[PDB]
Short mmCIF file of C-alpha atoms in Angstrom, two decimals:
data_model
loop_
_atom_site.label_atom_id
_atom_site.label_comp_id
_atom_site.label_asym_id
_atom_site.label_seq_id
_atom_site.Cartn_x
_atom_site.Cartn_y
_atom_site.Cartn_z
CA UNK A 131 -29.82 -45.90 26.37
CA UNK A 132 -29.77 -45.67 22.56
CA UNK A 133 -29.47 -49.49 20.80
CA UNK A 134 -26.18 -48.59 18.96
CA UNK A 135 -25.04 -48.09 22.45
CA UNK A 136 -26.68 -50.90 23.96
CA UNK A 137 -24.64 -53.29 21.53
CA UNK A 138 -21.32 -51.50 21.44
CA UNK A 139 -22.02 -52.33 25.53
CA UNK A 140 -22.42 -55.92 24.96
CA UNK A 141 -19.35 -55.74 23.39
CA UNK A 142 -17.11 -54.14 25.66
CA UNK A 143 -18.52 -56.38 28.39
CA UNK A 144 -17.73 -59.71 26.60
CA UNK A 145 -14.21 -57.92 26.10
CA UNK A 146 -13.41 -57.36 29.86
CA UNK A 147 -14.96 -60.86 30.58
CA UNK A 148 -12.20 -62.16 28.74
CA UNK A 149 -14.80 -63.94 26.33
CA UNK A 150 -13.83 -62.20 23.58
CA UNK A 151 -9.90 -61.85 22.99
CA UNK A 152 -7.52 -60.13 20.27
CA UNK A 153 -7.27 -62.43 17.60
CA UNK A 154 -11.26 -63.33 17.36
CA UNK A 155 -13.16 -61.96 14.49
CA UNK A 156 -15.86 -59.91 16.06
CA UNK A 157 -19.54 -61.03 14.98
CA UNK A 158 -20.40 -58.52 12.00
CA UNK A 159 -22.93 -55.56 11.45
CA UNK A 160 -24.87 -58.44 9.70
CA UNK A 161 -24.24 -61.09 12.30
CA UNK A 162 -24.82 -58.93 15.29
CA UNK A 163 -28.69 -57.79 13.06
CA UNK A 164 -29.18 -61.53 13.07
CA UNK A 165 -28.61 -62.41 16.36
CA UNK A 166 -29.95 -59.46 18.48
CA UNK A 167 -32.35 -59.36 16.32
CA UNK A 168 -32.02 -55.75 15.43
CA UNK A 169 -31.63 -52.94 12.49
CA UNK A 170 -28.60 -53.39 10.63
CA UNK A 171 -27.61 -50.19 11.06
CA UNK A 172 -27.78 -50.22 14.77
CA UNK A 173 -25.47 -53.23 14.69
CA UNK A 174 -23.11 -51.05 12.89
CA UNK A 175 -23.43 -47.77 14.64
CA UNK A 176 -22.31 -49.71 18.18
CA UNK A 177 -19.30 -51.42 15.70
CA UNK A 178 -18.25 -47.78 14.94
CA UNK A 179 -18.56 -46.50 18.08
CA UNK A 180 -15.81 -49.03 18.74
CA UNK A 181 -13.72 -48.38 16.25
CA UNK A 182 -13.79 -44.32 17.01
CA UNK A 183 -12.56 -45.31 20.98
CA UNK A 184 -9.62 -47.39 19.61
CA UNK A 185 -11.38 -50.93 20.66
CA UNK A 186 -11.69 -52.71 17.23
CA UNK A 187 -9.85 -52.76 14.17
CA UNK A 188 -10.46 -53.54 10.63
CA UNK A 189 -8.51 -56.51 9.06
CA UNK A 190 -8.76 -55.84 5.15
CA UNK A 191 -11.23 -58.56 3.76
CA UNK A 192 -11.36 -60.62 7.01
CA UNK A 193 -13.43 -58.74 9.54
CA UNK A 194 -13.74 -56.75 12.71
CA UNK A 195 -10.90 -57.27 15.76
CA UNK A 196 -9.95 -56.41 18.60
CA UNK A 197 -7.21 -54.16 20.13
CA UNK A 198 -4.82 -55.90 22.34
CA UNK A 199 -5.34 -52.13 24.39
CA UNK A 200 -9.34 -52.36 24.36
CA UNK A 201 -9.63 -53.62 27.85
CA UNK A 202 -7.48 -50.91 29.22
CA UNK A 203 -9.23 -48.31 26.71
CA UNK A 204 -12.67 -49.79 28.39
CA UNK A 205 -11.22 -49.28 32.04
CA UNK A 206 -9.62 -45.98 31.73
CA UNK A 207 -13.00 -44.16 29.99
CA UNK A 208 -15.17 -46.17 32.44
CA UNK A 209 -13.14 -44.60 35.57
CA UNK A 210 -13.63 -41.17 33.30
CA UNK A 211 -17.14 -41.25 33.06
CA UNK A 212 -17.40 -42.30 36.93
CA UNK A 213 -14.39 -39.33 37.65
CA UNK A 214 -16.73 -36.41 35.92
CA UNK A 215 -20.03 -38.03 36.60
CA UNK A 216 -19.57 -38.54 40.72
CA UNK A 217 -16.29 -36.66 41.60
CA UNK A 218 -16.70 -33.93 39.58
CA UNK A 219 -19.95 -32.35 40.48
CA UNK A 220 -18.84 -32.99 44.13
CA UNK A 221 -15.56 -30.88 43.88
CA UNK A 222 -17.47 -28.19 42.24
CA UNK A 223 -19.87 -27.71 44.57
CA UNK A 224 -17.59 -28.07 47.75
CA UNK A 225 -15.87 -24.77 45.82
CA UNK A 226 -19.03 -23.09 45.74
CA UNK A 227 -19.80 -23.69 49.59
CA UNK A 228 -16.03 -22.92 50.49
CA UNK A 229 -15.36 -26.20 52.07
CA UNK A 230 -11.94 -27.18 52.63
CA UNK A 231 -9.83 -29.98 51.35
CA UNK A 232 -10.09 -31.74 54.93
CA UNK A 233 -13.39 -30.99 55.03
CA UNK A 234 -14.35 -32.70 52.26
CA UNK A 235 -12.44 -35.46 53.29
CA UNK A 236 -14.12 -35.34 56.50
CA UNK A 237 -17.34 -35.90 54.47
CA UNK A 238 -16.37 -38.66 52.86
CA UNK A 239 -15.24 -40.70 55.77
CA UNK A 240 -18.34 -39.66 57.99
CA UNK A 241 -20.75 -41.03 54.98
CA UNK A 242 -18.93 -44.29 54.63
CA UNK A 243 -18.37 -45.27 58.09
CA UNK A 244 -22.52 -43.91 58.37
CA UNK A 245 -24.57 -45.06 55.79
CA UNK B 35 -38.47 -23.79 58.48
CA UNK B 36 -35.74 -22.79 55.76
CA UNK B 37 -37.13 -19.30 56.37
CA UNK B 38 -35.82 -19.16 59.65
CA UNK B 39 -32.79 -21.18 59.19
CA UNK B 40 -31.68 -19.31 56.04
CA UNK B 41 -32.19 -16.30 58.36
CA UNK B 42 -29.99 -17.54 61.20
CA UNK B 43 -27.33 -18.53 58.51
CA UNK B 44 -27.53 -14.67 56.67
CA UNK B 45 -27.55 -13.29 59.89
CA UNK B 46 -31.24 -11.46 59.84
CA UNK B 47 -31.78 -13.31 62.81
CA UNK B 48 -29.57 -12.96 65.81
CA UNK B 49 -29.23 -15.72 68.49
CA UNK B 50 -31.83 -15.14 70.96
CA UNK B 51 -33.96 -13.29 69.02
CA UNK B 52 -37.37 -13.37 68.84
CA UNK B 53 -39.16 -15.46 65.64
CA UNK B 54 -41.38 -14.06 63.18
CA UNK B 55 -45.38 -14.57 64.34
CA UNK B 56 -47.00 -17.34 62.85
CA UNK B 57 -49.21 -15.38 60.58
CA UNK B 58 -45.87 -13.63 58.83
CA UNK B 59 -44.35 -17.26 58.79
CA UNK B 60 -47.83 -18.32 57.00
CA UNK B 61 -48.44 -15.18 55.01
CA UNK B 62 -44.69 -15.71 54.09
CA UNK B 63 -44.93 -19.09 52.33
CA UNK B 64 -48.48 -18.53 51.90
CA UNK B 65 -49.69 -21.79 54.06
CA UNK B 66 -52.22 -22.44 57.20
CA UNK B 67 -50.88 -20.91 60.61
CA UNK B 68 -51.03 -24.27 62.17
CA UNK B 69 -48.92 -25.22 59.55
CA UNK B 70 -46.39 -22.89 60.48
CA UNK B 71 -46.58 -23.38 63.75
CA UNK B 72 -45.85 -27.25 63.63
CA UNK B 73 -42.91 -26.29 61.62
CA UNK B 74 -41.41 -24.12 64.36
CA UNK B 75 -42.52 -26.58 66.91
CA UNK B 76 -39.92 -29.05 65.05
CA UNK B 77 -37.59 -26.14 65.19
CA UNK B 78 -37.64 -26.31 69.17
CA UNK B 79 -37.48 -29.91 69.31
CA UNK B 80 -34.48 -30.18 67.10
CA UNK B 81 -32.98 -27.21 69.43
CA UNK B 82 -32.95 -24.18 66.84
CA UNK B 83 -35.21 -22.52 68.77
CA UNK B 84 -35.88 -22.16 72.53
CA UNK B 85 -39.38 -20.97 74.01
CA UNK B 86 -40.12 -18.96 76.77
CA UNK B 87 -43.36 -19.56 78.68
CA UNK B 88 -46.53 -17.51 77.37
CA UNK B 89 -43.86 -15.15 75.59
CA UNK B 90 -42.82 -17.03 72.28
CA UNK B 91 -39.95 -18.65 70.26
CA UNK B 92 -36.37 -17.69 70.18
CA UNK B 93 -33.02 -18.30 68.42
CA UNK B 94 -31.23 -20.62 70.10
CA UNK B 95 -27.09 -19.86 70.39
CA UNK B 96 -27.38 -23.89 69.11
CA UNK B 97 -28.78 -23.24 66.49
CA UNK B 98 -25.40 -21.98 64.07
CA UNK B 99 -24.22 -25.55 64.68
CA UNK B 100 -27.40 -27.23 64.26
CA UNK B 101 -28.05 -25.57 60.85
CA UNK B 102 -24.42 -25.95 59.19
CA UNK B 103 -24.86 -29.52 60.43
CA UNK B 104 -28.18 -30.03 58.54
CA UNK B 105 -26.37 -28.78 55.68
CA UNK B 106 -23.75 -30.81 55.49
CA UNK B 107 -26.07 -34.02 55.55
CA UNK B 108 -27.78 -32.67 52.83
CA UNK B 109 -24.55 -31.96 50.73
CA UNK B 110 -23.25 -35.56 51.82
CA UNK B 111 -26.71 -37.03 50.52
CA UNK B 112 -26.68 -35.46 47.12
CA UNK B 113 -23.06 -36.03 46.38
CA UNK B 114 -21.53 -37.77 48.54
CA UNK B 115 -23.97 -40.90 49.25
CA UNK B 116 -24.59 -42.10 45.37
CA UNK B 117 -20.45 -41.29 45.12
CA UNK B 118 -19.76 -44.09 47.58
CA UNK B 119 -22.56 -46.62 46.63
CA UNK B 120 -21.05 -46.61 42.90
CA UNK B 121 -17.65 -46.54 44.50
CA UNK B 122 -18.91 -49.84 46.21
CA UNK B 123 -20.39 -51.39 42.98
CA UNK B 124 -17.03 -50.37 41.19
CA UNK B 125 -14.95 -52.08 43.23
CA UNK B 126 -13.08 -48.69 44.36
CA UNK B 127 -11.97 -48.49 48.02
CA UNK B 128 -12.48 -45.75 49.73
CA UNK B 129 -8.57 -44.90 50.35
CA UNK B 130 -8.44 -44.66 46.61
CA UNK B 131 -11.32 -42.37 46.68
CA UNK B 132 -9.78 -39.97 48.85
CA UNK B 133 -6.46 -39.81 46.61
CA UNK B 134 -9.29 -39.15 43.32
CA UNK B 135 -10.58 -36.40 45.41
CA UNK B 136 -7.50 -34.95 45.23
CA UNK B 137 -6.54 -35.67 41.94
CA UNK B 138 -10.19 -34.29 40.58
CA UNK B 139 -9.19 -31.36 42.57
CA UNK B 140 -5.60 -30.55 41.08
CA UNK B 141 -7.20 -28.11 37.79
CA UNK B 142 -10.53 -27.81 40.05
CA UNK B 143 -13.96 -26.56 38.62
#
Protein backbone atom coordinates (compact mmCIF):
# COMPACT_ATOMS: atom_id res chain seq x y z
CA UNK A 1 0.00 0.00 0.00
CA UNK A 2 1.18 3.32 -1.46
CA UNK A 3 2.34 6.01 1.56
CA UNK A 4 -0.26 8.67 0.46
CA UNK A 5 -2.59 5.89 1.26
CA UNK A 6 -0.97 4.68 4.23
CA UNK A 7 -1.50 8.25 5.88
CA UNK A 8 -4.91 9.14 4.51
CA UNK A 9 -5.45 5.48 6.57
CA UNK A 10 -4.10 6.78 9.71
CA UNK A 11 -6.43 9.31 9.35
CA UNK A 12 -9.59 7.75 8.83
CA UNK A 13 -8.72 5.39 11.68
CA UNK A 14 -8.11 8.17 14.30
CA UNK A 15 -11.57 9.49 12.82
CA UNK A 16 -13.68 6.33 13.63
CA UNK A 17 -11.73 6.04 16.98
CA UNK A 18 -13.36 9.07 17.88
CA UNK A 19 -9.78 10.67 18.49
CA UNK A 20 -10.13 13.01 16.04
CA UNK A 21 -13.61 14.95 15.93
CA UNK A 22 -15.26 17.82 13.66
CA UNK A 23 -14.09 20.88 14.97
CA UNK A 24 -10.16 19.79 15.31
CA UNK A 25 -7.76 21.23 12.89
CA UNK A 26 -6.26 18.25 11.20
CA UNK A 27 -2.28 18.08 11.51
CA UNK A 28 -1.05 19.71 8.07
CA UNK A 29 0.80 18.42 4.85
CA UNK A 30 3.80 19.98 6.77
CA UNK A 31 2.94 18.65 10.19
CA UNK A 32 1.99 15.20 9.08
CA UNK A 33 6.03 15.37 6.87
CA UNK A 34 7.30 16.18 10.33
CA UNK A 35 5.88 13.73 12.31
CA UNK A 36 5.75 10.54 10.10
CA UNK A 37 8.64 11.50 9.04
CA UNK A 38 7.85 11.44 5.40
CA UNK A 39 7.85 13.44 1.83
CA UNK A 40 5.80 16.38 1.95
CA UNK A 41 4.04 15.52 -0.80
CA UNK A 42 2.96 12.19 0.43
CA UNK A 43 1.53 13.96 3.48
CA UNK A 44 -0.50 15.87 1.09
CA UNK A 45 -1.52 13.32 -1.45
CA UNK A 46 -3.30 11.15 1.65
CA UNK A 47 -4.86 14.96 2.76
CA UNK A 48 -6.36 15.06 -0.80
CA UNK A 49 -7.41 11.83 -1.00
CA UNK A 50 -9.59 12.99 1.88
CA UNK A 51 -10.82 15.82 0.67
CA UNK A 52 -11.90 14.03 -2.90
CA UNK A 53 -14.14 11.27 -0.53
CA UNK A 54 -15.92 14.17 1.28
CA UNK A 55 -13.88 13.51 4.76
CA UNK A 56 -12.06 16.90 5.26
CA UNK A 57 -12.71 20.32 4.50
CA UNK A 58 -10.80 23.42 3.99
CA UNK A 59 -11.40 26.36 6.46
CA UNK A 60 -10.01 29.53 4.52
CA UNK A 61 -6.68 30.53 6.35
CA UNK A 62 -7.20 28.17 9.34
CA UNK A 63 -6.57 24.63 8.20
CA UNK A 64 -7.78 21.18 7.34
CA UNK A 65 -11.28 19.72 9.14
CA UNK A 66 -13.29 17.35 9.37
CA UNK A 67 -16.81 16.46 8.05
CA UNK A 68 -19.36 15.90 10.66
CA UNK A 69 -20.40 12.87 7.75
CA UNK A 70 -16.67 11.41 7.54
CA UNK A 71 -17.30 8.57 9.84
CA UNK A 72 -20.32 7.47 7.98
CA UNK A 73 -18.45 8.31 4.53
CA UNK A 74 -15.54 5.89 6.11
CA UNK A 75 -18.19 3.09 7.00
CA UNK A 76 -20.28 3.10 3.96
CA UNK A 77 -17.00 2.84 1.33
CA UNK A 78 -15.39 0.38 3.79
CA UNK A 79 -18.64 -2.02 3.57
CA UNK A 80 -18.19 -1.13 -0.45
CA UNK A 81 -14.88 -2.25 -0.82
CA UNK A 82 -15.71 -5.48 1.42
CA UNK A 83 -19.36 -5.75 -0.82
CA UNK A 84 -17.28 -5.91 -4.37
CA UNK A 85 -14.13 -7.36 -2.98
CA UNK A 86 -15.81 -10.67 -1.08
CA UNK A 87 -19.52 -10.69 -2.21
CA UNK A 88 -19.07 -9.79 -5.49
CA UNK A 89 -16.74 -12.27 -7.01
CA UNK A 90 -18.84 -14.89 -5.09
CA UNK A 91 -22.22 -13.97 -6.81
CA UNK A 92 -20.52 -13.97 -10.07
CA UNK A 93 -19.20 -17.09 -10.00
CA UNK A 94 -22.28 -18.92 -8.38
CA UNK A 95 -23.94 -17.43 -11.92
CA UNK A 96 -21.39 -19.04 -13.86
CA UNK A 97 -21.83 -22.57 -12.10
CA UNK A 98 -25.76 -22.11 -12.13
CA UNK A 99 -26.18 -22.37 -8.47
CA UNK A 100 -29.29 -21.28 -7.01
CA UNK A 101 -30.17 -18.59 -4.58
CA UNK A 102 -30.75 -21.37 -1.78
CA UNK A 103 -27.92 -22.94 -2.78
CA UNK A 104 -25.74 -20.40 -2.21
CA UNK A 105 -27.23 -19.83 0.93
CA UNK A 106 -26.78 -23.35 1.70
CA UNK A 107 -23.03 -22.66 1.21
CA UNK A 108 -22.78 -20.12 3.37
CA UNK A 109 -24.33 -21.70 6.37
CA UNK A 110 -22.46 -25.14 5.80
CA UNK A 111 -18.95 -23.05 5.84
CA UNK A 112 -19.78 -21.17 8.97
CA UNK A 113 -21.24 -23.74 11.10
CA UNK A 114 -17.83 -25.96 9.47
CA UNK A 115 -14.83 -24.16 9.49
CA UNK B 1 -7.67 -37.60 -11.03
CA UNK B 2 -9.49 -34.42 -12.58
CA UNK B 3 -9.19 -36.43 -15.80
CA UNK B 4 -11.51 -38.85 -14.71
CA UNK B 5 -13.69 -36.74 -12.65
CA UNK B 6 -14.06 -34.02 -15.32
CA UNK B 7 -15.03 -37.08 -17.44
CA UNK B 8 -17.73 -38.40 -15.10
CA UNK B 9 -19.05 -34.74 -14.79
CA UNK B 10 -19.10 -34.22 -19.03
CA UNK B 11 -20.47 -37.44 -19.27
CA UNK B 12 -17.47 -39.31 -21.39
CA UNK B 13 -17.56 -41.65 -18.73
CA UNK B 14 -20.67 -43.54 -17.83
CA UNK B 15 -21.26 -45.03 -14.32
CA UNK B 16 -19.84 -48.37 -14.33
CA UNK B 17 -17.64 -47.97 -16.92
CA UNK B 18 -14.44 -49.11 -17.27
CA UNK B 19 -11.27 -46.42 -16.54
CA UNK B 20 -8.72 -45.49 -18.91
CA UNK B 21 -5.33 -47.92 -18.46
CA UNK B 22 -2.74 -46.49 -16.52
CA UNK B 23 -0.39 -45.86 -19.34
CA UNK B 24 -3.25 -43.49 -21.21
CA UNK B 25 -3.83 -41.89 -17.66
CA UNK B 26 0.20 -41.38 -17.63
CA UNK B 27 0.73 -40.70 -21.29
CA UNK B 28 -2.29 -38.30 -20.71
CA UNK B 29 -0.73 -35.93 -18.14
CA UNK B 30 2.54 -37.08 -19.18
CA UNK B 31 3.65 -38.57 -15.54
CA UNK B 32 5.05 -42.14 -14.16
CA UNK B 33 2.36 -45.05 -14.32
CA UNK B 34 2.71 -45.59 -10.67
CA UNK B 35 1.85 -42.20 -10.42
CA UNK B 36 -1.29 -42.67 -12.04
CA UNK B 37 -2.10 -45.49 -10.52
CA UNK B 38 -1.87 -44.08 -6.85
CA UNK B 39 -4.11 -41.42 -8.11
CA UNK B 40 -6.87 -43.84 -9.09
CA UNK B 41 -6.17 -45.86 -6.05
CA UNK B 42 -7.39 -42.55 -4.07
CA UNK B 43 -10.21 -42.55 -6.51
CA UNK B 44 -11.45 -46.04 -5.04
CA UNK B 45 -10.86 -45.14 -1.60
CA UNK B 46 -12.81 -41.96 -1.77
CA UNK B 47 -15.61 -44.23 -3.62
CA UNK B 48 -15.44 -42.75 -7.32
CA UNK B 49 -14.38 -45.76 -8.48
CA UNK B 50 -15.11 -49.44 -7.64
CA UNK B 51 -12.65 -52.42 -8.64
CA UNK B 52 -13.34 -55.68 -9.69
CA UNK B 53 -10.88 -58.45 -8.83
CA UNK B 54 -7.99 -59.07 -11.52
CA UNK B 55 -10.35 -57.10 -14.05
CA UNK B 56 -9.79 -53.27 -13.27
CA UNK B 57 -11.38 -49.95 -12.11
CA UNK B 58 -14.85 -48.76 -12.67
CA UNK B 59 -17.20 -45.74 -12.32
CA UNK B 60 -18.90 -45.91 -9.40
CA UNK B 61 -22.95 -44.77 -9.59
CA UNK B 62 -21.37 -42.67 -6.26
CA UNK B 63 -19.35 -41.07 -7.89
CA UNK B 64 -21.92 -37.97 -9.51
CA UNK B 65 -22.42 -37.10 -5.84
CA UNK B 66 -18.99 -37.51 -4.74
CA UNK B 67 -17.63 -35.20 -7.48
CA UNK B 68 -20.31 -32.22 -7.30
CA UNK B 69 -19.54 -32.53 -3.58
CA UNK B 70 -15.75 -32.01 -4.07
CA UNK B 71 -16.72 -29.12 -6.01
CA UNK B 72 -18.62 -27.39 -3.90
CA UNK B 73 -15.81 -27.49 -1.10
CA UNK B 74 -13.63 -26.11 -3.45
CA UNK B 75 -16.03 -23.19 -4.47
CA UNK B 76 -16.81 -22.69 -0.60
CA UNK B 77 -12.88 -22.49 -0.01
CA UNK B 78 -12.11 -19.90 -2.61
CA UNK B 79 -15.06 -17.69 -1.93
CA UNK B 80 -16.80 -18.54 0.57
CA UNK B 81 -14.11 -19.28 3.48
CA UNK B 82 -11.98 -15.77 3.26
CA UNK B 83 -15.87 -14.16 2.86
CA UNK B 84 -16.71 -15.32 6.37
CA UNK B 85 -13.27 -14.89 8.13
CA UNK B 86 -13.40 -11.01 7.05
CA UNK B 87 -17.07 -11.13 7.87
CA UNK B 88 -15.76 -12.24 11.40
CA UNK B 89 -12.98 -9.54 11.63
CA UNK B 90 -15.69 -6.94 10.43
CA UNK B 91 -17.90 -7.48 12.93
CA UNK B 92 -20.74 -8.66 10.31
CA UNK B 93 -23.03 -11.52 11.46
CA UNK B 94 -23.73 -13.95 9.40
CA UNK B 95 -27.71 -13.22 9.21
CA UNK B 96 -26.63 -9.94 7.76
CA UNK B 97 -24.52 -11.72 5.33
CA UNK B 98 -27.18 -13.68 3.97
CA UNK B 99 -29.51 -10.47 3.43
CA UNK B 100 -25.97 -8.83 1.43
CA UNK B 101 -26.09 -11.91 -0.60
CA UNK B 102 -29.17 -10.95 -1.70
CA UNK B 103 -28.79 -7.48 -2.01
CA UNK B 104 -25.29 -8.07 -4.14
CA UNK B 105 -27.52 -10.22 -6.12
CA UNK B 106 -30.49 -7.74 -7.00
CA UNK B 107 -28.46 -6.10 -10.55
CA UNK B 108 -26.22 -9.46 -10.43
CA UNK B 109 -22.89 -9.87 -12.43
Amino acid sequence: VPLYKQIASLIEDSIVDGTLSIDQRVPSTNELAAFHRINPATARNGLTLLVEAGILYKKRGIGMFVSAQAPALIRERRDAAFAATYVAPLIDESIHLGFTRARIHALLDQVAESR
